[PDB]
Amino acid sequence: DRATWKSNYFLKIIQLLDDYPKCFIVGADNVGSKQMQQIRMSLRGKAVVLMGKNTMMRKAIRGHLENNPALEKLLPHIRGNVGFVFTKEDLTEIRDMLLANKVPAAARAGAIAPCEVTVPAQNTGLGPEKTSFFQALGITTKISRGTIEILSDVQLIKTGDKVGASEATLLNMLNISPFSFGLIIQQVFDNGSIYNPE
Amino acid sequence: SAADRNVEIWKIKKLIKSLEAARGNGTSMISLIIPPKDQISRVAKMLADEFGTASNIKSRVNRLSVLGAITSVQQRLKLYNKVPPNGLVVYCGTIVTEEGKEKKVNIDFEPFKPINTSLYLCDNKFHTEALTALLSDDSKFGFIVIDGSGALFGTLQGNTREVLHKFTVDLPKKHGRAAQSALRFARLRMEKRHNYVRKVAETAVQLFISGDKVNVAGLVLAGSADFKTELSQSDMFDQRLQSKVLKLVDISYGGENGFNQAIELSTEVLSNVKFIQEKKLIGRYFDEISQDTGKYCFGVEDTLKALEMGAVEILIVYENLDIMRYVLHCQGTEEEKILYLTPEQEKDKSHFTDKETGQEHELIESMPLLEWFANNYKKFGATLEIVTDKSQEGSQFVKGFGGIGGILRYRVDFQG
Amino acid sequence: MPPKFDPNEIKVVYLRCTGGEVGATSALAPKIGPLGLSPKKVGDDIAKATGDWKGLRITVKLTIQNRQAQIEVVPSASALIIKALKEPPRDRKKQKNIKHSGNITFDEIVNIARQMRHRSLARELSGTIKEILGTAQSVGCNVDGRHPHDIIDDINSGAVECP
Amino acid sequence: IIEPSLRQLAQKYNCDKMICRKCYARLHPRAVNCRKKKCGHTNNLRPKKKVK
RNA sequence: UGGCCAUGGAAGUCGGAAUCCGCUAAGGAGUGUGUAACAACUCACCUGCCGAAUCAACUAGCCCUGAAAAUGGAUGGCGCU
Ligand SMILES: [Zn+2]
């Protein structure tokens, strides 16, 4: 194990490179197995998704094989948490399909905020429970007959702001999930030419 | 096997129920019972005199039925050469029944458990009060009997008086007639004496334990000279055995002649054990009602539903409760339903018309629920705990709670 | 169903499993049952009627409540349908030694099993599904007198027929 | 009653510990061996039992 | 995939016969926590950072734990690193 498998992994990546002349480098990021399965089910017919390591630092060996240049441009961009998407359809269409899929995934306590997150005026869906968790920071909440109702549309977290722990937990209890993303596109490979999501 | 024993018990329980219902004429029946030690010839002699005296019964019907009943039992007893262990229970007669069917009947059987009860009777009906009284009191108690001469071990069902094991010992003298050696010999005497307690305690673990969990519901020490007290409170005595020590009896005499003295003294305390186990259980049930908790049930509407569903852990029942399981049936459509009814709701009830269709819904005959609980608690959740109305907690459970409840496996919600 | 007692439509589903016969220990209704208008004994009788004459060796019970009428269905599990297609039927009470005979062939019968799978598996068609259901069998032991393991590798059938 | 993050901070100091099976020494939870020369750095350790 | 035995509940998890395939980058028909039972949590394969050794299982030397006695005390004593 892990000598024959390592050789089998080299055979997987080279065959995918030989089959498809176009690849889409996608950042994995905070991602679930459930997400990856959903993406597999959506992109089943056309594309083939892969997730690699520093044996993707091995496109060099494909470029060595009595043929290819152009794969030399792709070596620096295999950094961070990276996985590939091999495919033959198109480039701008596939970019739109990747952007369109995505997933919610609830608040990460500590990380940055991508958009201006809000709390709409609505009931929590509980009995006479702790209103003190909501009112600790600066939110107007009443016990309007049993249910804890928020009485105003207020912005908690703004763009480029750090998400606190107590406010993250309250958003998770409310089922408000603007944070996270799913997966991001950093760079592209299209028959030799490189693009930067443009 | 344990399962085969339970089937043999149920077989006899069923048989017993059918014999109590029997009924017959004048005093044509016989209820005869023989203990295991007894000789059959002596019994066959007794019946031969009872046959002779019966020859001068004035009334016809009775006389001829009696003599034939006495001849049958005499012939059944010819087949056995000895009275078997567990005794013998002979039930002869000529029972009247439906269809005007005055039929002869004979049931000799060696019962399960040993019986220490003799009985000769004739009557209009059979008398199985001995057998049913046995079947209730399965509770065995142990009897360790210490003496400076030698020990004894035996057990004690409600009826039967057993001997398990006994030994005698060559113990030393009280005194040592030297000044210096007095002390050494006195220590030596006390070490021999302690080794004897150890042996008795070891043999007691040998006898009274079963699968690292003692069979005897209690245990009694019975002696004199603070020798039982040596055993009772010693660290030598295994705590699983020691925790069931209920009485330390003070007896004159020793061994098997002291044994039956120890039983006579220990009677009230050995009767109270069932009453104590009742209190402990219903006390445990009532604590759940005292707190919020919600790991309880009560009423045949609830307690059964709880048993049907996410099952109970313990199913408390009062003997007397009288609530019964009928099976109702339709004439035309062949629809049916079973319900658990009270004494007045079962005797006469205009509820049972089918209504939706418009027919009379005939209530096909019952069986009554204590019996139903016993039939299939094993196929539910189990520990069918029969309790009485004697204890203060039991009295509440019977009078207040309707004599039915349960301690559940977890919390359960109920509505309506 | 939220505030007090209201059916706006009620096509409510919940998943019970196991149901050869009525069952004394039941555990069918409560919790979900009574609140929602489905009863207990009648619901057990309806559950027996659907899961009657096959399967009597364990079944699955999705319960779609239409206000008061439950629609019990048998959604297929792989091992259940293998046990249904065994050497039937010695149902209950001996029995006893035990339910693991496991020499009942099924070569082209498992083709139907891979077809009846509710898509699932993230597969590249039956070629891979054949390998899965040929090993799901804890009991069966594959064809006539074969093993499962590595005979699966050399399949020569039903690649294009199963879609 | 008590603020959760504040609680877990005081747990860290009182309850997130290893315990020596020989000498009952209270040890940091990463511990593989004991501190105590009295029990010869036993290595028979167990976790401190959590309050239910 | 409520896999099978076990219903008293074990859909990975009181126990035991099993014990493979798919997706696979890859996850045991499951190390535990805990559950009536789930859930929820926790325990490979792979990356990002950092920057050369790292780690396991035995084995035997000294040292230490194991190592409790009654007048105050004896490597002979003083002492000795
Ligand atoms: Zn220690």
PDB file of all heavy atoms in Angstrom, chain D residues 19-25 27 34-45, ligand 1:
ATOM      1  N   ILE D  19      -4.861  11.962  35.454  1.00  0.00           N
ATOM      2  CA  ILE D  19      -4.660  11.542  36.821  1.00  0.00           C
ATOM      3  C   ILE D  19      -3.878  10.241  36.855  1.00  0.00           C
ATOM      4  O   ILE D  19      -4.181   9.316  36.105  1.00  0.00           O
ATOM      5  CB  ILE D  19      -5.995  11.289  37.527  1.00  0.00           C
ATOM      6  CG1 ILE D  19      -6.938  12.496  37.410  1.00  0.00           C
ATOM      7  CG2 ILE D  19      -5.746  10.908  38.986  1.00  0.00           C
ATOM      8  CD1 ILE D  19      -6.496  13.713  38.192  1.00  0.00           C
ATOM      9  N   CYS D  20      -2.903  10.165  37.754  1.00  0.00           N
ATOM     10  CA  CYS D  20      -2.071   8.978  37.881  1.00  0.00           C
ATOM     11  C   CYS D  20      -2.812   7.866  38.617  1.00  0.00           C
ATOM     12  O   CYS D  20      -3.473   8.103  39.629  1.00  0.00           O
ATOM     13  CB  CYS D  20      -0.750   9.320  38.566  1.00  0.00           C
ATOM     14  SG  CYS D  20       0.284   7.897  38.954  1.00  0.00           S
ATOM     15  N   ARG D  21      -2.684   6.655  38.088  1.00  0.00           N
ATOM     16  CA  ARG D  21      -3.408   5.486  38.587  1.00  0.00           C
ATOM     17  C   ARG D  21      -2.751   4.910  39.840  1.00  0.00           C
ATOM     18  O   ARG D  21      -3.377   4.155  40.588  1.00  0.00           O
ATOM     19  CB  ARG D  21      -3.464   4.403  37.503  1.00  0.00           C
ATOM     20  CG  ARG D  21      -4.728   3.566  37.486  1.00  0.00           C
ATOM     21  CD  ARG D  21      -5.905   4.387  36.973  1.00  0.00           C
ATOM     22  NE  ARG D  21      -6.892   3.606  36.229  1.00  0.00           N
ATOM     23  CZ  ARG D  21      -6.707   3.089  35.015  1.00  0.00           C
ATOM     24  NH1 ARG D  21      -5.545   3.224  34.373  1.00  0.00           N
ATOM     25  NH2 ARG D  21      -7.696   2.417  34.439  1.00  0.00           N
ATOM     26  N   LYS D  22      -1.484   5.256  40.049  1.00  0.00           N
ATOM     27  CA  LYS D  22      -0.731   4.808  41.202  1.00  0.00           C
ATOM     28  C   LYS D  22      -0.950   5.822  42.334  1.00  0.00           C
ATOM     29  O   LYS D  22      -1.465   5.463  43.391  1.00  0.00           O
ATOM     30  CB  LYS D  22       0.760   4.706  40.843  1.00  0.00           C
ATOM     31  CG  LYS D  22       1.525   3.522  41.435  1.00  0.00           C
ATOM     32  CD  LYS D  22       1.719   2.354  40.459  1.00  0.00           C
ATOM     33  CE  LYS D  22       3.193   1.965  40.317  1.00  0.00           C
ATOM     34  NZ  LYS D  22       3.396   0.744  39.487  1.00  0.00           N
ATOM     35  N   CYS D  23      -0.589   7.085  42.089  1.00  0.00           N
ATOM     36  CA  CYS D  23      -0.430   8.097  43.155  1.00  0.00           C
ATOM     37  C   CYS D  23      -1.474   9.216  43.198  1.00  0.00           C
ATOM     38  O   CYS D  23      -1.341  10.151  44.002  1.00  0.00           O
ATOM     39  CB  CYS D  23       0.954   8.744  43.035  1.00  0.00           C
ATOM     40  SG  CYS D  23       1.141   9.904  41.655  1.00  0.00           S
ATOM     41  N   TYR D  24      -2.484   9.138  42.330  1.00  0.00           N
ATOM     42  CA  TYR D  24      -3.527  10.165  42.215  1.00  0.00           C
ATOM     43  C   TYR D  24      -3.042  11.569  41.864  1.00  0.00           C
ATOM     44  O   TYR D  24      -3.794  12.525  42.017  1.00  0.00           O
ATOM     45  CB  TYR D  24      -4.366  10.236  43.494  1.00  0.00           C
ATOM     46  CG  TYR D  24      -4.905   8.913  43.902  1.00  0.00           C
ATOM     47  CD1 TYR D  24      -4.269   8.163  44.875  1.00  0.00           C
ATOM     48  CD2 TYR D  24      -6.047   8.404  43.315  1.00  0.00           C
ATOM     49  CE1 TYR D  24      -4.760   6.936  45.267  1.00  0.00           C
ATOM     50  CE2 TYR D  24      -6.550   7.175  43.690  1.00  0.00           C
ATOM     51  CZ  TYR D  24      -5.898   6.440  44.670  1.00  0.00           C
ATOM     52  OH  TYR D  24      -6.368   5.208  45.062  1.00  0.00           O
ATOM     53  N   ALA D  25      -1.819  11.710  41.377  1.00  0.00           N
ATOM     54  CA  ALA D  25      -1.338  13.026  41.007  1.00  0.00           C
ATOM     55  C   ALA D  25      -2.218  13.592  39.907  1.00  0.00           C
ATOM     56  O   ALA D  25      -2.619  12.873  38.992  1.00  0.00           O
ATOM     57  CB  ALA D  25       0.104  12.966  40.544  1.00  0.00           C
ATOM     58  N   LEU D  27      -2.559  15.789  36.758  1.00  0.00           N
ATOM     59  CA  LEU D  27      -1.597  16.039  35.686  1.00  0.00           C
ATOM     60  C   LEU D  27      -2.245  16.738  34.515  1.00  0.00           C
ATOM     61  O   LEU D  27      -3.445  16.602  34.300  1.00  0.00           O
ATOM     62  CB  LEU D  27      -1.033  14.720  35.177  1.00  0.00           C
ATOM     63  CG  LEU D  27      -0.415  13.795  36.215  1.00  0.00           C
ATOM     64  CD1 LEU D  27      -0.075  12.475  35.546  1.00  0.00           C
ATOM     65  CD2 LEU D  27       0.814  14.419  36.864  1.00  0.00           C
ATOM     66  N   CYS D  34       3.519  10.113  34.577  1.00  0.00           N
ATOM     67  CA  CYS D  34       3.268  10.894  35.770  1.00  0.00           C
ATOM     68  C   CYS D  34       4.446  11.813  36.055  1.00  0.00           C
ATOM     69  O   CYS D  34       5.521  11.689  35.469  1.00  0.00           O
ATOM     70  CB  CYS D  34       2.982   9.976  36.966  1.00  0.00           C
ATOM     71  SG  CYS D  34       2.505  10.825  38.486  1.00  0.00           S
ATOM     72  N   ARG D  35       4.205  12.750  36.957  1.00  0.00           N
ATOM     73  CA  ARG D  35       5.234  13.640  37.470  1.00  0.00           C
ATOM     74  C   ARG D  35       6.061  12.902  38.498  1.00  0.00           C
ATOM     75  O   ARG D  35       7.285  13.028  38.554  1.00  0.00           O
ATOM     76  CB  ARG D  35       4.576  14.816  38.197  1.00  0.00           C
ATOM     77  CG  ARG D  35       5.294  16.142  38.045  1.00  0.00           C
ATOM     78  CD  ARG D  35       4.758  16.921  36.860  1.00  0.00           C
ATOM     79  NE  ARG D  35       3.328  17.234  37.003  1.00  0.00           N
ATOM     80  CZ  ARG D  35       2.768  18.425  36.797  1.00  0.00           C
ATOM     81  NH1 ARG D  35       3.484  19.459  36.391  1.00  0.00           N
ATOM     82  NH2 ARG D  35       1.458  18.573  36.972  1.00  0.00           N
ATOM     83  N   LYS D  36       5.350  12.121  39.307  1.00  0.00           N
ATOM     84  CA  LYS D  36       5.757  11.836  40.665  1.00  0.00           C
ATOM     85  C   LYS D  36       6.799  10.751  40.752  1.00  0.00           C
ATOM     86  O   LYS D  36       6.571   9.614  40.326  1.00  0.00           O
ATOM     87  CB  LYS D  36       4.534  11.454  41.512  1.00  0.00           C
ATOM     88  CG  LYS D  36       3.433  12.511  41.568  1.00  0.00           C
ATOM     89  CD  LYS D  36       3.929  13.848  42.096  1.00  0.00           C
ATOM     90  CE  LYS D  36       2.812  14.861  42.226  1.00  0.00           C
ATOM     91  NZ  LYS D  36       3.395  16.184  42.566  1.00  0.00           N
ATOM     92  N   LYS D  37       7.944  11.119  41.322  1.00  0.00           N
ATOM     93  CA  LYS D  37       8.995  10.168  41.630  1.00  0.00           C
ATOM     94  C   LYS D  37       8.514   9.087  42.606  1.00  0.00           C
ATOM     95  O   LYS D  37       9.034   7.973  42.586  1.00  0.00           O
ATOM     96  CB  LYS D  37      10.233  10.888  42.186  1.00  0.00           C
ATOM     97  CG  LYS D  37      11.430   9.967  42.383  1.00  0.00           C
ATOM     98  CD  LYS D  37      12.764  10.697  42.359  1.00  0.00           C
ATOM     99  CE  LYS D  37      13.916   9.710  42.238  1.00  0.00           C
ATOM    100  NZ  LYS D  37      15.229  10.378  42.016  1.00  0.00           N
ATOM    101  N   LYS D  38       7.515   9.403  43.434  1.00  0.00           N
ATOM    102  CA  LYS D  38       6.945   8.426  44.367  1.00  0.00           C
ATOM    103  C   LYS D  38       6.344   7.198  43.682  1.00  0.00           C
ATOM    104  O   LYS D  38       6.411   6.101  44.237  1.00  0.00           O
ATOM    105  CB  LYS D  38       5.907   9.081  45.301  1.00  0.00           C
ATOM    106  CG  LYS D  38       4.527   9.329  44.698  1.00  0.00           C
ATOM    107  CD  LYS D  38       3.845  10.563  45.282  1.00  0.00           C
ATOM    108  CE  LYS D  38       3.412  10.380  46.730  1.00  0.00           C
ATOM    109  NZ  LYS D  38       2.668  11.569  47.242  1.00  0.00           N
ATOM    110  N   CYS D  39       5.768   7.378  42.494  1.00  0.00           N
ATOM    111  CA  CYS D  39       5.191   6.265  41.735  1.00  0.00           C
ATOM    112  C   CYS D  39       5.987   5.919  40.487  1.00  0.00           C
ATOM    113  O   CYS D  39       5.532   5.123  39.666  1.00  0.00           O
ATOM    114  CB  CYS D  39       3.752   6.575  41.351  1.00  0.00           C
ATOM    115  SG  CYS D  39       3.577   7.934  40.183  1.00  0.00           S
ATOM    116  N   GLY D  40       7.172   6.510  40.353  1.00  0.00           N
ATOM    117  CA  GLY D  40       8.098   6.182  39.274  1.00  0.00           C
ATOM    118  C   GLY D  40       7.555   6.463  37.890  1.00  0.00           C
ATOM    119  O   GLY D  40       7.629   5.603  37.004  1.00  0.00           O
ATOM    120  N   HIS D  41       6.996   7.660  37.721  1.00  0.00           N
ATOM    121  CA  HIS D  41       6.514   8.134  36.425  1.00  0.00           C
ATOM    122  C   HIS D  41       5.603   7.084  35.757  1.00  0.00           C
ATOM    123  O   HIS D  41       5.695   6.817  34.562  1.00  0.00           O
ATOM    124  CB  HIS D  41       7.720   8.512  35.557  1.00  0.00           C
ATOM    125  CG  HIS D  41       8.857   9.099  36.339  1.00  0.00           C
ATOM    126  ND1 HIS D  41       8.790  10.342  36.928  1.00  0.00           N
ATOM    127  CD2 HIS D  41      10.075   8.597  36.655  1.00  0.00           C
ATOM    128  CE1 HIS D  41       9.923  10.589  37.561  1.00  0.00           C
ATOM    129  NE2 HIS D  41      10.720   9.547  37.410  1.00  0.00           N
ATOM    130  N   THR D  42       4.703   6.539  36.574  1.00  0.00           N
ATOM    131  CA  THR D  42       3.933   5.321  36.305  1.00  0.00           C
ATOM    132  C   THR D  42       3.537   5.037  34.869  1.00  0.00           C
ATOM    133  O   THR D  42       3.739   3.927  34.386  1.00  0.00           O
ATOM    134  CB  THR D  42       2.610   5.334  37.102  1.00  0.00           C
ATOM    135  OG1 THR D  42       2.828   5.925  38.387  1.00  0.00           O
ATOM    136  CG2 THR D  42       2.076   3.921  37.293  1.00  0.00           C
ATOM    137  N   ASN D  43       2.925   6.028  34.233  1.00  0.00           N
ATOM    138  CA  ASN D  43       2.282   5.909  32.913  1.00  0.00           C
ATOM    139  C   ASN D  43       0.900   5.239  32.910  1.00  0.00           C
ATOM    140  O   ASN D  43       0.141   5.450  31.963  1.00  0.00           O
ATOM    141  CB  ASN D  43       3.224   5.358  31.812  1.00  0.00           C
ATOM    142  CG  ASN D  43       3.058   3.868  31.544  1.00  0.00           C
ATOM    143  OD1 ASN D  43       4.036   3.125  31.576  1.00  0.00           O
ATOM    144  ND2 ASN D  43       1.840   3.429  31.245  1.00  0.00           N
ATOM    145  N   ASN D  44       0.585   4.409  33.904  1.00  0.00           N
ATOM    146  CA  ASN D  44      -0.812   4.102  34.183  1.00  0.00           C
ATOM    147  C   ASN D  44      -1.467   5.394  34.604  1.00  0.00           C
ATOM    148  O   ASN D  44      -1.304   5.825  35.744  1.00  0.00           O
ATOM    149  CB  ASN D  44      -0.979   3.080  35.306  1.00  0.00           C
ATOM    150  CG  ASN D  44      -0.789   1.659  34.838  1.00  0.00           C
ATOM    151  OD1 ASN D  44       0.185   0.997  35.201  1.00  0.00           O
ATOM    152  ND2 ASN D  44      -1.728   1.174  34.029  1.00  0.00           N
ATOM    153  N   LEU D  45      -2.155   6.037  33.667  1.00  0.00           N
ATOM    154  CA  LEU D  45      -2.926   7.234  33.961  1.00  0.00           C
ATOM    155  C   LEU D  45      -4.359   7.031  33.521  1.00  0.00           C
ATOM    156  O   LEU D  45      -4.663   6.156  32.704  1.00  0.00           O
ATOM    157  CB  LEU D  45      -2.356   8.453  33.241  1.00  0.00           C
ATOM    158  CG  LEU D  45      -0.858   8.743  33.332  1.00  0.00           C
ATOM    159  CD1 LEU D  45      -0.547   9.890  32.383  1.00  0.00           C
ATOM    160  CD2 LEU D  45      -0.401   9.075  34.745  1.00  0.00           C
TER     161      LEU D  45
HETATM  162 ZN    ZN F   1       1.764   9.037  40.120  1.00  0.00          ZN
END
